[PDB]
Design a protein around this ligand. Structure first.
Ligand code: MG
Ligand code: MG
Ligand code: MG
Ligand code: MG
Lengths: 134, 11, 69, 100, 120, 36, 197, 143, 49, 38, 219, 62
RNA sequence: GGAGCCAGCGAGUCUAACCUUGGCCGAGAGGUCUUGGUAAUCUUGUGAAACUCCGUCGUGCUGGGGAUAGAGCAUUGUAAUUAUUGCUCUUCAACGAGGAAUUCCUAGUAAGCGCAAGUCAUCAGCUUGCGUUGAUUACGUCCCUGCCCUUUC
């Protein structure tokens, strides 16, 4: 009875991002190479090749933990201080991440708003969790 | 290079 | 100060020679003793543990502790 | 070949021991993020220092910087009265003095 | 019904509710295993009662902890207090008072905060 | 040993925009007293 | 031990006995100097230093505090580090590891020996100055303060982190070598007291 | 220093002002310090880098003089440097690499070498030979 | 007015600079509706607010 | 321009003189309005 | 006539006072709070670091304290002073003007903390007696006849000027020396309850936007 | 070598300077021998102090 | 630079346009289509910050510092090319722990971090409240200083 919650967050996110890169079906927008991920950030991501996949893994994991989540909550979650007044994250990247995760079938549009973890995505993430626990 | 009894420049 | 920023053949061999002798191995030790950059020390330590010339005791992102194999 | 301790790029002296991004930042008109983008477009790995750069890498960097729009650098990304005010202040001051 | 008890632990604004029922040693916090609680450095602070009285007493029970309020340190203290209190309530109300009595002296000998709330 | 000359001013003053701002503060204070 | 929630083997070894960070045992550690025995507290083992106890209520509640917790508390000073006790605990963990590395002796024994050695045994007071004996509690307090201060100042603008420099200060103090800042200050204070003796 | 612009108080140039301050203008002579600094700074021992100078002002201000400095030879420019130093508490080189003159925290004792011999110049004290004195002193110490 | 916090509010177009606001502190003011108010303090930025 | 509220009083030398004359007058006859124990 | 809230205990128990400031007090406000402590014989200063108003009053009430003084500042300048009486009020809020601390006096010396004589003048309206009754009972009862310390509250157009003086009786006249501090305090809220209860009924509140405010007198 | 002496009595009304306490200590080596000393930190009874010189007798430090 | 990730005090739209979830567009700022809430119900678990893990950097006024300045992309009015408040890029100064001196401070106290409302005085990067992390030393003395009490001596 393995689940996402039985695996460490960092271990699961790294492993699932690695699988997403290996699969190669996750659509990555063209502007990932020129974006900062937030207004508060001073520099763009250092790991240019794989930061988008890691964010997709983060979004998938949180969607697993919480039944429904929207772009606003993820924007707040991934945002940090720039007195510094906790500027929110970038909406576009999170929206594209959600769209890509839905294209893979990991998530789907939710009634009542937000996104739901697809049963297919549920089993998929469970599979990565089982592999990581090994 | 200052040497001996030379004084610092005056501007 | 001037710290070596590139790996050369003499430095490569000199790394492989003394590091087994040291009781305590860390990024600071390599910087202080070998006059090598911190980044090269981190990269070297990742290599050296791979060949098993040193063993890891406690790993932390900021601080890594190693000892002679 | 031999590591280049110093290099001449766009009429500027850049140290070899610094990373490419933070060495190219020295050039006027080039900051940290602009140098990062120039490197990424030039397909140069950022982990390399400035001295390991081959001549072709440097020439490609030159043409990135000199022709940004030609290489899809974003447009958004790329780059008496005081005396009158003083006189008005003096008029204010003298009138206020006359009041007191 | 299935045997079970409730207990509460609190520190600052952090509060933890512990459900202790008969079972097979399933310990979970916030819907996750006790092993994955964060921050890592304070994990052994969460483990305290487990290793003080031993896991044999736990092999026959399941504990579920839900924590809210406060910060990470306060939440960890709430977790350990709730685990202790739920343990002792269970061993009172379906185990001989003698077992309860050793559990109490063990906990009070190590740290009184596990049982008695420390309100500043 | 190396020799370096000291750098100093012939006359020490403890640019004009700062001077303009300084007069504003005095004018702000002086006017407020008269209003009171 | 098989449990529905998986538990590491090291956790069962810790069931066997309480060990600081599950790596250091309190059984064999002993204070070498008799006079400090009832002010340096090591008998009650603890997994982690963080205790959130109340030791400022009464004048001599501090002595009952575990010495490692006192070291962690003293490690956080200078404003920019105030209130970040988790960082202090992590640093002390790394320091104990480094001590065990450089010398195979148990790190807690090193801490105890260093505190015993570097405690100023005789000090001065203004009247001019006159020599005065030092209470054991003040000896412990000044020892911990000197060790922490020297370790911090050593690595203030150096590549060395606080962990390694603290370990170096601790081992040098335990040896009694003059290389440690705290031993230098102790000897200087004792010399000044002897002059006004 | 005193605002008239701030000027280094002098025994001759300023007499009425120091009378207002109530200080005896006999003890108002900075040129004596200037000549001592001049003869001291230009000594070959300074050129050998074996001499370092401290100044304790009558007010209680301790000034550290880097051996590398080249104070002006004329007194007028010397006065200008003191007033800049006393107000700004430090003097920077023309090349802007080191602070030649810097005010430091009293006492002098902490700044001095750990092992060092201390002596004063006393007219009433027994007459000694400077060369014989320095020879008989130890080497690791300073004077 | 341009920014309102219940009773408190920030106003524009009385004055061209904080010079002017300096005298009219404590001055009696009211709206067309008849709500009475007071000029409390001049905003440093922008001028006239 | 009309004022909405009373201005903040200023402690000029005359005001201090009047206040201290008041205090001296009160104390001369020991006219103290102080709480008395019951 | 003494108020009902004080009528039971007027002159029977010495007042117990806690002087405190707002969260993160500036250095000057801490100095000012220290001065207020020295003003009242039975005042104790308490650092308000992270204390909570329900927690503060509950702890204060349990300890048996009579009155609580909370000071507010703006850039190290005292601006307001509120006095709350236990167990059920009143709470009176004041605004301080022209505050001058003794720290601004060089070579000032040390105060005397004998039970001081009190002077209240120009309090003629009903509200004026209420203010006098509030201020009087902060001090201990029955000051010594030869006590050298006198505290005065002078009401001048609702602006209560507060001064502290020490006197010596000479053959021809009385000479008073000011000890400070100087400050003018004006009442702008008086409520039937403790400062914690924000819903306590308001006995009186200062109307500032009424047209007659510029000339109206209340004390 | 430094002797060890256990505190038996914490003297009061000695006129000692602030920050210093006059105490009476009995040597561990010889219980009968007892000496008055001055202590610079928080001191109580039944604690042990290290003495460099067992010969000096404490005097009031004003 | 990523990832983990947790509070409490409160506010919020009728003859109106307040807090705003969700969807889409936008590099960001923001725009746009809807939706819940006159509120322990919806915004909101206010997924606050510091903090912790994995990485880059590396004692270099350096990837600390962000004062000053230029050019752009937008909001708010208003009819001016007027300012206003945000974002992007570039520019990258003084400062390397601070003299004589001086002020405050004893437990959830010093210190660090953020979140909310501007509710008739005061306040506008300022006031107040709220929450998060959380110490060292002392808790003894009248010796110095200062202020008192008693001698209904
Ligand atoms: Mg404040
Ligand atoms: Mg504070
Ligand atoms: Mg704050
Ligand atoms: Mg006391």
């Amino acid at each position: 009875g393995v689940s996402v919650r039985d695996v460490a967050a960092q271990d699961f996110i790294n492993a699932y991002a690695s699988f997403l890169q290996r699969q190669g079906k996750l659509e990555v927008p063209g502007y990932v190479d020129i974006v900062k991920t937030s207004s508060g950030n001073e520099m763009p991501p250092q790991d240019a090749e794989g930061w988008f996949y890691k964010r997709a893994a983060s979004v998938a994991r949180h969607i697993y933990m919480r039944k429904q989540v929207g772009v606003g909550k993820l924007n707040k979650l991934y945002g940090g201080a720039k007195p510094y007044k906790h500027i929110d994250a970038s909406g576009s990247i999170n929206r594209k991440v959600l769209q890509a995760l839905e294209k893979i079938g990991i998530v789907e549009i939710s009634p009542k708003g937000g996104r739901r973890i697809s049963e297919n995505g549920q089993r998929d993430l469970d599979r990565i969790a089982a592999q990581t626990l090994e | 290079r200052f040497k001996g009894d030379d004084d610092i420049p005056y501007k | 100060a001037q710290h070596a920023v590139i790996l050369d053949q003499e430095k490569y061999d000199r790394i492989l020679k003394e590091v087994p002798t040291y009781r305590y191995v860390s990024v600071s030790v390599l910087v202080d003793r070998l006059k090598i950059g911190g980044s090269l020390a981190r990269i070297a330590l990742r290599h050296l543990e791979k060949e098993g010339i040193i063993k890891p005791i406690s790993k932390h992102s900021k601080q890594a502790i190693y000892t002679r194999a | 070949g031999s590591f280049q301790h110093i290099l001449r790029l766009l009429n500027t002296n850049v140290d070899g021991n610094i990373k490419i991004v933070y060495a190219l930042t020295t050039i006027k008109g080039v900051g940290r993020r602009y140098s990062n983008l120039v490197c990424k477009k030039a397909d140069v790995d950022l982990h390399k220092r400035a001295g390991e750069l081959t001549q072709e890498e440097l020439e490609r960097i030159v043409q990135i910087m000199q022709n940004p729009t030609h290489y899809k650098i974003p447009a958004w990304f790329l780059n008496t009265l005081a005396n009158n005010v003083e006189s008005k202040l003096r008029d204010d001051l003298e009138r206020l003095k006359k009041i007191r | 019904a299935v045997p079970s008890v409730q207990t509460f632990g609190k520190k600052k604004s952090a509060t933890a509710v512990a459900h202790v029922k008969a079972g097979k040693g399933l310990i979970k916090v916030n819907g996750s295993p006790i092993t994955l609680v964060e921050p890592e450095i304070l994990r052994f602070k969460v483990y305290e009662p487990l290793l003080l009285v031993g896991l044999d007493k736990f092999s026959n029970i399941d504990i579920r902890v839900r924590v809210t309020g406060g910060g990470h340190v306060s939440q960890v203290y709430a977790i350990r207090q709730a685990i202790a209190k739920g343990l002792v309530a269970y061993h009172q109300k379906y185990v001989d008072e003698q077992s309860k009595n050793e559990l109490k002296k063990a906990f009070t000998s190590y740290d009184r905060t596990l049982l008695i709330a420390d309100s500043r | 040993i190396p020799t370096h000359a000291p750098k100093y001013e012939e006359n020490f003053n403890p640019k004009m925009k700062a001077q303009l701002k300084k007069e504003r503060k005095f004018t702000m204070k002086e006017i407020r007293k008269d209003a009171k | 031990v098989v449990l529905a929630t998986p538990i590491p083997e090291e956790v069962q070894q810790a069931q066997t006995e309480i060990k600081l960070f599950n790596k250091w045992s309190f059984e064999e550690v002993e204070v070498k100097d008799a006079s400090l025995v009832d002010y340096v507290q090591v008998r009650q083992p603890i997994f982690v230093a963080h205790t959130a106890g109340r030791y400022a209520n009464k004048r001599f509640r501090k002595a009952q505090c575990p010495i490692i917790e006192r070291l962690t508390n003293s490690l956080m000073m200078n404003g920019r580090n105030n209130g970040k006790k988790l960082k202090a605990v992590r640093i002390i963990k790394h320091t104990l590891d480094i001590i065990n590395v450089l010398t195979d002796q148990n790190p807690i024994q090193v801490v105890v020996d260093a505190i015993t050695n570097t405690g100023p045994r005789e000090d001065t007071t203004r009247v001019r100055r006159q020599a005065v004996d030092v209470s054991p509690l003040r000896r412990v307090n000044q020892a911990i303060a000197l060790l922490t201060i020297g370790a911090r100042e050593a690595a203030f603008r150096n590549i060395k982190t606080i962990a390694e420099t603290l370990a170096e200060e601790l081992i040098n103090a335990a040896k009694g070598s003059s290389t440690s800042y705290a031993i230098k200050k102790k000897d200087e204070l004792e010399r000044v007291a002897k002059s006004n003796r | 220093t005193h605002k008239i612009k701030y000027v280094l108080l002098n025994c001759d140039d300023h007499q009425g002002l120091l009378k207002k301050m109530g200080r005896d203008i006999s003890e108002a002579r900075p040129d004596i310090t200037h000549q001592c600094l001049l003869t001291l700074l230009d000594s070959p021992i300074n050129k050998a880098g074996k001499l370092q100078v401290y100044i304790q002002t009558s007010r209680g201000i301790l000034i550290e003089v880097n051996p590398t400095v080249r104070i002006p030879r004329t007194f007028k420019r010397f006065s200008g440097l003191m007033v800049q130093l006393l107000h700004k508490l430090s003097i920077r080189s023309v090349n802007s690499e080191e602070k030649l003159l810097k005010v430091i925290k009293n006492p002098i004792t902490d700044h001095l070498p750990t092992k060092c011999r201390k002596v004063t110049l006393s007219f009433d004290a027994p007459v000694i030979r400077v060369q014989d004195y320095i020879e008989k002193l130890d080497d690791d110490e300073s004077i | 007015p341009y920014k309102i916090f219940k009773n408190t509010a920030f106003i524009k177009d009385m004055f061209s600079s904080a010079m002017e606001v300096a005298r009219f502190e404590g001055a009696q003011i009211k709206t067309v509706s008849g709500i009475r108010g007071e000029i409390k303090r001049a905003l440093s930025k922008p001028e006239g607010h | 321009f009309d004022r909405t509220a009373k201005p903040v009083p200023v402690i000029t030398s005359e005001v201090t003189e009047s206040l201290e004359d008041m205090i001296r007058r009160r104390i001369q006859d020991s006219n103290f309005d102080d709480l008395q124990r019951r | 006539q003494v108020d009902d809230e004080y009528a039971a205990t007027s002159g029977i128990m010495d007042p117990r006072i806690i002087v405190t400031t707002s969260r993160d007090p500036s250095t000057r406000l801490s100095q000012f709070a220290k001065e207020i402590k020295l003003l009242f014989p039975n005042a104790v200063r308490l650092n308000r670091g992270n204390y909570v108003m329900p927690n503060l009053v509950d702890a204060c009430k349990k300890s048996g304290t009579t009155d609580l003084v909370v000071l507010h500042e703006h850039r190290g300048v005292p601006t307001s002073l509120t006095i709350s009486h236990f167990p059920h009020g009143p709470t009176a809020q004041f605004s301080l003007h022209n505050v001058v601390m003794r720290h601004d006096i060089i070579n000032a010396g040390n105060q005397s903390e004998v039970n001081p004589h009190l002077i209240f003048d120009n309090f003629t309206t009903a509200l004026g007696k209420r203010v006098v009754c509030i201020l009087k009972h902060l001090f201990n009862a029955g000051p010594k006849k030869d006590s050298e310390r006198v505290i005065t509250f002078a009401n001048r157009g609702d602006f209560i000027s507060v001064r502290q003086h020490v006197y010596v009786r000479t053959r021809e006249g009385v000479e008073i020396a000011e000890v400070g501090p100087r400050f003018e305090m004006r009442l702008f809220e008086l409520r039937l309850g403790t400062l914690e209860n924000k819903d306590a009924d308001v006995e009186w509140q200062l109307r500032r936007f009424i047209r007659t405010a510029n000339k109206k007198d209340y004390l | 070598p430094v002797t060890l002496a256990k505190v038996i009595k914490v003297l009061g009304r000695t006129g000692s300077r602030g920050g210093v306490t006059q105490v009476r200590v009995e040597f561990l080596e010889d219980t009968s021998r007892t000496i008055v000393r001055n202590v610079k930190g928080p001191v109580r009874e039944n604690d042990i102090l290290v003495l460099m010189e067992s010969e000096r007798e404490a005097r009031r430090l004003r």
